[PDB]
Amino acid sequence: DVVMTQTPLTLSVTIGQPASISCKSSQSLLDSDGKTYLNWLLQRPGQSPKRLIYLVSKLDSGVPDRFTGSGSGTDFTLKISRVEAEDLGVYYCWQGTHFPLTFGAGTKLELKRADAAPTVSIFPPSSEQLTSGGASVVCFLNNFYPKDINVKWKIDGSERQNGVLNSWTDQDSKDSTYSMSSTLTLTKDEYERHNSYTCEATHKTSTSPIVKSFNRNE
Amino acid sequence: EVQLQQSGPELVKTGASVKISCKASGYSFTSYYMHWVKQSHGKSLEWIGEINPYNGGASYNQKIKGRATFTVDTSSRTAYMQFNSLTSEDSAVYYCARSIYGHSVLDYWGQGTSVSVSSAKTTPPSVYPLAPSMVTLGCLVKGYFPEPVTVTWNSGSLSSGVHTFPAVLQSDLYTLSSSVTVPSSTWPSQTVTCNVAHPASSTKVDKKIVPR
């Protein structure tokens, strides 16, 4: 198989600014018929893959002229003259000169924006879950930027580390923010042996963390 | 408009087979090749093969070891892929794609069919309400298998302030949550309900979020 190597594998772009992806093949993609079957593909979140460029530099009909493809032989480039919000997604180069068709690993393009502090919410276990004998406490850390964030759980003033599962969204296409959920799962019996439950979010937007708590006695 | 409509998500027993379909519309079916492509963990793409719907002739990536078999029904404009002897390594999203003229230049892609390969039984989710300017509510969708689930709020009438978090696997079951943020003047005065569907278990649950 022909190896397709993209660089960089991640882009972080200010809207309006140019960006570029390189693609290098382990073997020339020039055919004996005189054509070079080097292609670019975009997969946006919530969408099917879509064709961007084919035959090195030909634009798909649905693609704006902000995109250009260039290159020859073993070395290829995708350029975006001015990045727009719609450009968020994963870009693949792929070749159809040799059998089998092979794809690069993908370059993930993310957008820059102004720093935003998280909106933090904490939720006790539902009555439904407690009736079943279980207890999940959930913390949302919503609509923040940049990506890096820390969540600390405290129970009755004591830092708690185990039974915590975290999940992070992909960057939002509408506002360029991130969100994260954190779920602490205890037995109902352990849950009921404590009073206060606290979620603490540490983000670059403040020296002090954002603390949300509830008390079972309240 | 060219349309490539693929069949729904599949759970497959380890060692068993799956047959997935791609119904084409908006063009002359026998005039373009159809390709099948695997995408693992939502990232890397691997070509499985192609079929010429005019003559039924297939070509396969040799890395598949002859486990795939492509067919077409020209009368229904459908391409099929049967994939045998599945293991956990074959859990992936499978796409069909059309090429011009055929074989070289893929130009349109189906939406994908998620295939999970596992020894585990299907388990429906437990759906729990998450109740505590703007108020944030949520829905906890716990302990299901396999992916996917779909979550909506107010049957689609609340969409703007909704985030659904990717599922996390722990001890062979998935859990995810969904968040919605509405005006404090809106809830609890107006109803807010999460609607959670899990295709594999034929389950759909509506959970109203009520003040606790």
Author numbering:
A (entry chain L): 1 to 27, 27A, 27B, 27C, 27D, 27E, 28 to 213
B (entry chain H): 1 to 52, 52A, 53 to 82, 82A, 82B, 82C, 83 to 100, 100A, ...
Provide the publication's sentences verbatim.
The urokinase plasminogen activator (uPA) system, comprised of uPA, a specific cell surface receptor for uPA (uPAR), and serpin inhibitors of uPA such as plasminogen activator inhibitor-1 (PAI-1), plays a central role in many of these activities. Recently, we identified and developed a novel uPAR targeted monoclonal antibody that demonstrates robust antitumor effects in a number of different animal tumor models but does not block the binding of uPA to uPAR. In addition, we determined the crystal structures of the ATN-658 Fab fragment alone and in complex with uPAR, the amino terminal (uPAR binding domain) of uPA (ATF), and the somatomedin B domain (SMB) of vitronectin. Moreover, we showed that ATN-658 binding blocks the association of another integrin, α5β1, to uPAR and thus impairs integrin α5β1-mediated adhesion to extracellular matrix. These results suggest a previously unrecognized mechanism by which uPAR may function in tumor progression and a novel epitope for the therapeutic targeting of this receptor.
